[PDB]
Ligand binder design. Structure first.
Ligand SMILES: CCCCCCCCCCCCCCCCCC(=O)OC[C@H](COP(=O)([O-])OCC(O)COP(=O)([O-])OC[C@@H](COC(=O)CCCCCCCCCCCCCCCCC)OC(=O)CCCCCCCCCCCCCCCCC)OC(=O)CCCCCCCCCCCCCCCCC
Ligand code: HEA
Ligand SMILES: CCCCCCCCCCCCCCCCCC(=O)OC[C@H](COP(=O)([O-])OCC[N+](C)(C)C)OC(=O)CCCCCCCCCCCCCCCCC
Ligand SMILES: CCCCCCCCCCCCCCCCCC(=O)OC[C@H](COP(=O)([O-])OCC[N+](C)(C)C)OC(=O)CCCCCCCCCCCCCCCCC
Ligand SMILES: [Cu+2]
Ligand SMILES: [Cu+2]
Ligand SMILES: [Cu+2]
Ligand SMILES: [Mg+2]
Lengths: 110, 77, 50, 49, 95, 52, 223, 221, 130, 105, 102, 172, 51, 128
């Protein structure tokens, strides 16, 4: 398990660090985005919200839902992609939200 | 928030200040702010009804308000 | 999930510099405008920018 | 010593604190619906940490 | 299951008697902890509900109080304007 | 390095034809070729074929 | 080094602005968009002027509380003429009343001998956590804290918020900051730094945006 | 309903003076505790928006910066920096609103180039380098064609404003000062980076390095 | 994890809003937001009387302001009188404004009397116990 | 997909698959494309629902980034490419529109 | 059989990730047009667009005004969050020359 | 473990001496150096140092109990494997001493996962001690009582240290 | 103190046994987690007792 | 310009001072620098006129191209020729002895732009 974790780390964190070391004439931002994406975005993040009921009560879940929708507002964020949606009701019981997509503001859950 | 409780002050000087502001606002707004210089501060109006219940009750009473208006007119000549 | 990876989406920025034995907090000029442009929840969860 | 005290003392303490001391509330507060809750005891004092 | 397999799985050592006697006592020592944890969870939920209400309806009530005070001023202003009209009729006999 | 005429945004019929073409091309991928869905996928697949 | 050569042809960058779908920032008087620029060096010996510092900050220096010698009365001038001199004290009913006591004597008696007890709250017993300035921030919103250090590593440690940001020299570390309640939190330095490692306190006040805006317009905007 | 229903009558003053308010009693519901709750409203306001204190010597409202309980209680006699209370809003209206995050701003140099690192030092250098290129283009035209003009008739926003603000955001003032020293050293000599750059001759080829760069991109609705 | 907390208090509901005229206030505020008026003073239903200059010239302050200089459009918003479009789309919100003002006046007319024996235990009726 | 409707991209269906195929795997525009798939669920087939979905995309772009009133109405080319990143409201709008186009049913 | 089940689960994850388009295309063809239309109708949400005031008051004038198909709002909903691109003089001139429909 | 880790600490302190007295700017950010490298080198030495401090005491308890209980230890091979696994995994957990210095989140996740997984080799030791304490001929001795005190202290210390790898708690 | 709004958050007494304050979400989560962490030992604890 | 308030006066002073950086630094000259005869004002105006004439030709083509890549490619293709000519001009002006030599070099550069530069630009634009 430890060796698999270390190999996974070196695959996407160590070696890709050496791909770009000089300013690039063509699509420099594209290449830097590629290097960063294969490292910054990890799978676990999605679970971190896909099972948010394991520690978030209903009301805390509602508050953290609005907080997460605010904090992941920026569109240019590959980590926000591959992250389970905050437009969801609490599995146990939902108080604030009556329907998933019935809002008065697009970027606010109410 | 942990807001503590404190009742209306009814302080003499504070209520005199708030009542002077209220009289200025009444005189200004009774003519749709046609004065040369308007000194009314609307926000303090709110505080007049939060910390001077006795004077607010006097102003609501028609006879008390009539007396206040007569005295203010005498003062303004 | 709540205290990390949200630098891009912040209302405004404060700089904390730790000189020896006292702190320095810097508000940049742009912050001023960032505080003027703030949506407000008015009515039934409707947001307005003035 | 091993079982009864280490598994009931803190619960008894919290129950007595809420029952008698009102969980140590600073009572001079205005609106319960707008005030933070003084939580009952939650850090166990009968565990080493 | 398999008694022989489960009686020497733990490093060929036998603690099955103490394991068997552990369930009966362990079935009751967790009740005070569980009930007080229920109390604590309810307190946490109530606090989170209060946080949501103060975040949402906190600002709204202050505006309602502001409008109440402005409406009191409006009533006083209507009466004051009626008095001003009367004084406009009675130029100086009112005083 | 000239440029070509940009057609107007497609109507619903053209969008439906595009969706049909995309799904038909999706159906053609062999299950033993593990290429993820991405812009370069088809290109990669072509490359892979030639490489093989 | 070398020289500023007599002529330089400079390519105007394209696409730096997308405000109204225009990729040509510059246009000459004839109305034709410009792709190139000519820069000339008229004077070959003069120095080149230093870049003017555009950056302007509101800087709050939070240091430990300094002991008072005398309680100076509140004095307001018309200039150089005392318009109003007073000795205000904040009463228990939230009024700045006129004090009939000697404020210096009260200060010195609190300094000398103040009543204390075993179970005394941290609110009423502040000896190492006192500063002369407060960092005021809004609540229920996102603040990017850029942490850095002038000389050595310090640790901005807020126990009430349960956070600690390591201020490291040469590292402009960006942290997200969200406070979900109205709260006045004290804090300390949690990285060994020298003489006054213990006496390096922090005070952060998270307030609702109306009160934060009042503080910002009254104490922040005037710089 | 008349065809002009909803049209504001000419000379409408929005005035409610001398109006019968007994016709609206069926358009709202007040619960039995409305009298109690009203008081609570006032109470909360009187103790929540009252961050200022009336002064008898000045006979006016004053205030001070946020202070701890120990200083407010045991140093109430020794108060410093008292400023006359100016009001929450200039016009006296209400300001008690719930806030949120305003829309983001366009990015010229993305943060996602170096986003795995919480410390923005390579990103700071990259953004400052891009701004310095833009400045080297426009630095001497600023006082004649841009923000620093004498008259507002010829006022134009400096083309490097966004890159400058991004670089300022990514860098602390110390590192920004270091980079400004470097920028001065390179602008005194007029050192464009293209005068020295040759590393593209020792870089591996990429699909983005094709001679026909405009035709490499496939556009699709 | 799955059942680490061993219990979740779903019984405690959201705090019920029992404010006197909150519904009318929110309705009026939504209606005013529909009008899309730059002036914020219109949020209060009493604006025609508190700030009558909004209907004549818009001068609400006697040059005692700090909103910076009139360099952009988003300046001196309260120093801008209501236009014909703003006045029309505010008149469309007249009935809700009147209902809000009537609710406020009725609430003001409510006085604490000696027959309110349940004043000291009004929290229970206010539904503060969950 | 914190801003979208589904916990995982597989619940989005064919529309999310087409959005993935539209952009490179490191491009965050896909998420915006996904939002298009959310806006045109019951609207694509309705002749005015399509216009409503495009208006929803315009509002979404205006809310994510600061925008000017005419800015999204004067876009010369609404086509997208693989390396189009949501750095501007125009790019957000284009990605959202492309997602709307790919929403069958 | 434990190894076989683990291998099958791993292959299922790999196929789900890598053949998303093919799987979704196959799933879209398992139901007829009517079923998919019903499902799409059930999942139709406004998402916060054009969430203007909905008059609940019975005597509200805006209730009848909104029932009118020819009613024009002062500004389009997507334009309520866009910065103005014209001068204040132009804005005031346009608003003062504005005339109400009907 | 000491043979592996000693040169790293020696190099770090020699670099510190050169930086102090020759102005080599090894740990000065202004012209190339980085202060974080010093923490990396020192803690790469340091966590194995605490492990080499603690393991021989594990050896001490494993001899007294079999001596006084008149029976074989529960499983000596598993205890040896547990200490060897702790030694091998002590080289990949030093970063838990540097959570807040601004490490990349991948590094923090790696360090936290490997540090939390230390609890499994350490639980093997406790289970083996408990199983070695049963079903035997017990002779109560002062070394035995000291071993029991060690057992209690180690239990508390190990649990508390395991809590410290919970990153959110570790920040506070 | 900010007016009658007591912005103070700690109120931590001497001989304090737990967290300084529970007015922040992180510390509330940690407190609940610690309590329930101590809940899940019963059987194991009981087992050792008998041993 | 005299009548204004304090803020307007300060802003005017700031705008004036931001333009006198060339005035303040002209006194601080270096002895060891390699001086050259600068390009005269009339030659500067002629060179700028030639550049504007070039911009006249390219304007419809670049404003009718909807791709930034094509416009950047057009800019790069012309810039290489212009940079070669600029290098020739810089060498021949730095190595100039009198104003006659500097005028000769500037005239040669302007004539190159007006004779071959326009032809090269036209060929490029026809290609696009
Ligand atoms: C006659 C016998 C009748 C038996 C009927 C069946 C039992 C029903 C119980 C239901 C309880 C329940 O659901 O509670 C949920 C209830 C959930 O509360 P909530 O939902 O937050 O809202 C509170 C309510 O609004 C308001 O709640 P409240 O403030 O009114 O709290 C009262 C509640 C509080 O609940 C309890 O006290 C529950 C019982 C505690 C444990 C009982 C002994 C178990 C010993 C096991 C071994 C330990 C080692 O007590 C009861 O309801 C008890 C009713 C029956 C009393 C007689 C029981 C005798 C036999 C006990 C066996 O739990 C609590 O309130 C917890 C408070 C107590 C925490 C623990 C206190 C100490 C416990 C240990 C006592 C000493 C034992 C060791 C002795 C030696 C020490 C050295
Ligand atoms: C030799 C001494 C020693 C030992 C053995 C350990 C062992 C462990 N340590 Fe410790 N540690 C130090 C000495 C030691 N440590 C020192 C000196 C520092 C200071 C460094 C500095 O200044 O920063 C430090 C710092 C330190 C930190 C960083 C704290 C901070 O950054 O300042 C962390 C967590 O990241 C940590 C964790 C651990 C863990 C998980 C173990 C694990 O190996 C523990 C393994 C034990 C178990 C996990 C099994 C427990 C047994 C049970 C069956 C549990 C059940 C029992 C009950 C519930 C009571 N240690
Ligand atoms: C991780 C493991 C932790 C524990 C490991 C072991 C080490 C610690 C061992 C502790 C041993 C007990 C010490 C305390 C003893 C007193 C208990 C106490 O005060 O608890 C506080 C608790 C709590 O008291 P409290 O209600 O004041 O709570 C504190 C309240 N606050 C915090 C708000 C101030 O009190 C009780 O539990 C009282 C009820 C129990 C009383 C039991 C008396 C009878 C004892 C019988 C002994 C056995 C039978 C003998 C028969 C003889 C026949 C001849
Ligand atoms: C492992 C250690 C197990 C034994 C712990 C003994 C108690 C330690 C302690 O001081 O606990 C604080 C607790 C006090 O709890 P507390 O500090 O939470 O009190 C809450 C009330 N206020 C905050 C107002 C003070 O001490 C006790 O409850 C003592 C009980 C008797 C212990 C007798 C031991 C012999
Ligand atoms: Cu320090
Ligand atoms: Cu320190
Ligand atoms: Cu360690
Ligand atoms: Mg440290």
């Amino acid at each position: 398990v430890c060796g698999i974790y270390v190999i996974h780390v070196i695959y996407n964190y160590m070696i890709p660090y050496y791909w770009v070391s000089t300013p690039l004439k063509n699509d420099e931002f594209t290449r830097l985005r590629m290097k960063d994406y294969i490292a910054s975005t990890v799978l676990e993040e999605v679970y971190g919200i896909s099972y948010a009921e394991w520690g978030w009560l209903p009301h805390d879940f509602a508050y953290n839902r609005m907080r997460g929708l605010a904090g992941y507002m920026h569109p240019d964020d590959p980590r926000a992609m591959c992250t389970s949606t905050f437009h969801r009701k609490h599995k146990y019981i939902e108080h604030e939200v009556e329907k998933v997509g019935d809002y008065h503001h697009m970027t606010y859950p109410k | 928030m942990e807001v503590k409780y404190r009742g209306p002050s009814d302080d003499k000087l504070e209520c005199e200040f708030l009542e002077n502001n209220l009289l200025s606002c009444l005189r200004e707004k009774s003519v749709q702010d046609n004065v040369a210089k308007m000194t009314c501060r609307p926000e303090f109006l709110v505080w007049f009804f939060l910390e001077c219940p006795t004077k607010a009750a006097v102003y609501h009473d028609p006879k008390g308000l009539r007396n206040i208006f007569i005295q203010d007119k005498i003062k303004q000549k | 999930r709540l205290i990390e990876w949200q630098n891009e989406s912040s209302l405004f920025t404060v700089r904390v510099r730790a000189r020896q034995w006292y702190w320095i907090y810097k508000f940049e000029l742009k912050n001023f405008t960032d505080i003027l442009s703030t949506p407000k929840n008015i009515g039934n969860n409707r947001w307005q920018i003035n | 010593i091993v079982l009864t005290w280490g598994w009931s003392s803190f619960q008894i303490g919290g129950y007595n604190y809420e029952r008698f001391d009102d969980n140590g509330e600073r009572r001079n507060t205005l609106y319960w619906k707008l005030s933070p809750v003084e939580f009952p005891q939650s850090k166990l004092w009968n565990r080493p940490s | 299951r398999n008694r022989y397999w489960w009686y020497r799985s733990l490093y060929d050592d036998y603690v099955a008697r103490e394991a068997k006697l552990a369930f009966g006592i362990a079935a009751f020592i967790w009740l005070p902890h569980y009930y007080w944890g229920i109390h604590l969870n309810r307190a946490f939920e109530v606090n989170f509900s209060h946080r949501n209400y103060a975040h949402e309806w906190g600002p709204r009530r202050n505006r309602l109080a502001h409008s109440l005070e402005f409406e009191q001023f409006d009533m006083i202003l209507e009466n004051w304007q009626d008095l001003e009209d009367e004084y406009a009729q009675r130029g100086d006999g009112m005083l | 390095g000239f440029e070509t005429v940009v057609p107007a945004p497609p109507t619903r019929d053209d969008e439906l034809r595009m969706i049909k073409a995309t799904e038909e091309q999706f159906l053609q991928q062999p299950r033993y070729k593990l290429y993820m869905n991405e812009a370069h996928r088809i290109a990669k697949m072509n490359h892979g074929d030639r490489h093989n | 080094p070398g020289e500023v050569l007599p002529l330089r042809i400079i390519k105007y960058p394209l696409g730096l602005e997308t405000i109204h779908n225009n990729i040509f920032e510059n246009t000459n008087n004839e109305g034709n968009v410009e792709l190139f620029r000519l820069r000339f060096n008229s004077n070959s010996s003069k120095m080149q002027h230093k870049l003017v510092q555009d950056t302007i900050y509101l800087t709050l220096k939070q240091k430990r509380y300094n002991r008072k010698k005398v309680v100076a009365p509140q004095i307001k001038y018309y200039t150089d003429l005392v318009k109003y001199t007073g000795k205000p004290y904040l009463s228990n009913d939230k009024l700045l009343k006129q004090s009939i006591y000697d404020q210096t004597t009260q200060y010195k008696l609190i300094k000398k001998n103040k009543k204390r007890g075993e179970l005394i709250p941290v609110t009423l017993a502040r000896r190492i956590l006192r500063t002369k300035k407060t960092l005021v921030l809004p609540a229920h919103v996102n603040i990017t804290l850029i942490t850095n250090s002038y000389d050595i590593v310090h640790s901005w440690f807020i126990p009430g918020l349960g956070i600690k940001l390591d201020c490291v020299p040469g590292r402009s570390t960006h942290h997200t900051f969200f406070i979900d309640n109205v709260g006045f939190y004290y804090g300390q330095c949690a990285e060994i730094c020298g003489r006054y490692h213990h006496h390096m306190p922090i005070r952060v006040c998270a307030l609702p945006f109306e009160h934060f805006l009042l503080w910002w317009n009254t104490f922040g905007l005037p710089k | 309903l008349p065809a002009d229903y909803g049209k504001m009558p000419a000379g409408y003053n929005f005035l409610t003076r001398g109006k019968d308010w007994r016709e609206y009693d069926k358009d709202f519901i007040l619960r039995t505790d409305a009298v109690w709750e009203k008081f609570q409203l006032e109470h909360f306001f009187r103790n929540y928006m009252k961050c200022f204190f009336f002064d008898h010597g000045l006979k006016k409202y004053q205030m001070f910066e946020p202070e701890d309980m120990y200083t407010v209680v045991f140093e109430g006699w020794a108060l410093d920096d008292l400023i006359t209370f100016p009001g929450f809003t200039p016009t006296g209206r209400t300001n008690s609103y719930q806030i949120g995050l305003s829309p983001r701003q366009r990015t010229v140099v993305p943060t996602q180039t170096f986003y795995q690192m919480q410390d923005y030092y390579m990103l700071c250098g990259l953004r400052f380098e891009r701004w310095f290129r833009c400045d080297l283009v426009y630095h001497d035209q600023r006082h004649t064609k841009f923000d620093q003009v004498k008259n507002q008739k010829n006022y134009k926003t400096y083309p490097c404003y966004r890159e400058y603000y991004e670089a300022q955001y990514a860098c602390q003032d110390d590192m920004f000062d270091f980079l400004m020293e470097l920028a001065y050293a390179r602008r005194a000599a007029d050192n464009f980076e293209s005068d020295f750059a040759s590393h593209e001759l020792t870089t591996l080829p990429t699909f983005y390095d094709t001679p026909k760069a405009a035709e490499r991109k496939t556009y699709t609705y | 994890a799955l059942f680490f907390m061993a219990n979740t208090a779903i019984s405690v509901p959201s705090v019920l809003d029992t404010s006197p005229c909150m519904k009318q206030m929110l309705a009026y505020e939504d209606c005013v937001l529909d009008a899309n008026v730059p002036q914020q003073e219109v949020i209060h239903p009493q604006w025609p009387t508190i700030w009558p200059r909004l209907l004549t010239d818009g001068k609400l302050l006697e040059f005692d302001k700090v909103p910076f200089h009139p360099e952009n459009i988003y300046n001196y918003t309260y120093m801008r009188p209501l236009t014909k479009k703003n006045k029309q789309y505010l008149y469309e919100c007249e009935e809700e404004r009147f209902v809000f003002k009537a609710c406020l006046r009725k609430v003001i007319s409510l006085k604490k009397t000696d027959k309110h024996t349940s004043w000291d235990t009004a929290e229970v009726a206010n539904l503060q116990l969950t | 997909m914190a801003q979208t409707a589904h916990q995982n991209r597989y619940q989005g269906g064919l529309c999310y698959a087409q959005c993935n195929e539209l952009f490179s795997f490191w491009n965050p525009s896909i998420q915006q494309c996904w939002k298009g798939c959310d806006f045109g669920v019951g609207r694509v087939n309705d002749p005015e629902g399509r216009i409503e979905a495009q208006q929803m995309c315009k509002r979404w772009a205006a809310e994510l980034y600061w925008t000017y009133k005419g800015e999204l109405d004067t876009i010369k080319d609404l086509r997208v490419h693989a390396d189009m990143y949501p750095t501007t409201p125009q790019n957000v709008y284009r990605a959202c529109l492309a997602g709307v186009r790919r929403q069958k049913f | 059989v434990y190894c076989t089940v683990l291998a099958y689960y791993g292959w299922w994850l790999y196929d789900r990730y890598y053949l998303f388009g093919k799987n979704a295309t196959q799933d879209i063809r398992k139901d007829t047009t009517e079923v998919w239309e019903k499902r799409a109708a059930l999942n139709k949400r406004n998402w916060g667009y054009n969430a203007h005031y909905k008059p609940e008051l019975e005597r509200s004038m805006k209730k009848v005004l909104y029932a009118d198909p020819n009613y024009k709002f002062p500004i389009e909903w997507p334009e309520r969050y866009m910065a103005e691109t014209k001068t204040l003089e132009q804005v005031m001139d346009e608003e003062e020359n504005w005339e109400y429909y009907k | 473990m000491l043979a592996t880790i000693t040169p790293v600490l020696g190099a770090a302190v020699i670099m510190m001496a050169f930086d102090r007295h020759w102005q080599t700017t090894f740990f000065e950010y202004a012209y190339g150096g980085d202060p974080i490298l010093s923490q990396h080198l020192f803690w790469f030495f340091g966590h194995p140092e605490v492990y080499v401090l603690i393991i021989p005491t594990f050896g001490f308890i494993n001899m007294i109990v079999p001596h006084n209980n008149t029976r074989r230890v529960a499983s000596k091979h598993h205890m040896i494997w547990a200490i060897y696994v702790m030694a091998y995994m002590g080289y990949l957990v030093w970063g838990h001493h540097m959570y807040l210095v601004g490490l990349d989140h991948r590094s923090r996740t790696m360090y936290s996962t490997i540090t939390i997984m230390i609890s499994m080799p350490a639980t093997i030791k406790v289970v083996n001690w408990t199983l070695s304490l049963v079903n035997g001929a017990l002779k109560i001795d002062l070394p035995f009582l000291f071993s029991m005190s060690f057992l209690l202290l180690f239990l508390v210390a190990g649990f508390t240290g395991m809590w410290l790898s919970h990153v959110s708690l570790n920040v506070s | 103190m900010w007016g009658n709004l007591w912005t103070e958050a700690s109120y931590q007494l001497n001989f304090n046994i737990g967290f300084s304050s529970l007015r922040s979400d992180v510390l509330i989560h940690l407190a609940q987690w610690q309590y329930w962490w101590w809940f899940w030992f019963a059987l194991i604890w009981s087992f050792y007792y008998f041993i | 310009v005299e009548e204004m308030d304090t803020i307007q006066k300060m802003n005017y002073e700031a705008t004036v001072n931001m333009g006198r950086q060339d005035l303040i630094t002209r006194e601080y000259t270096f002895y060891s620098d390699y001086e050259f005869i600068p390009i005269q004002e009339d030659r500067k105006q002629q060179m700028e006129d030639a550049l504007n004439n070039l911009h006249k030709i390219i304007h419809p083509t670049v404003t009718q191209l909807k791709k930034k890549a094509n416009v950047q490619e057009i800019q790069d293709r012309v810039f290489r020729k212009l940079q070669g000519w600029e290098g020739e001009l810089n060498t021949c002006v730095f190595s100039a002895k009198n104003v006659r030599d500097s005028n000769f070099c500037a005239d040669r550069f302007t004539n190159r732009i007006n004779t071959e530069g326009v032809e090269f630009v036209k060929q490029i634009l026809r290609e696009y």
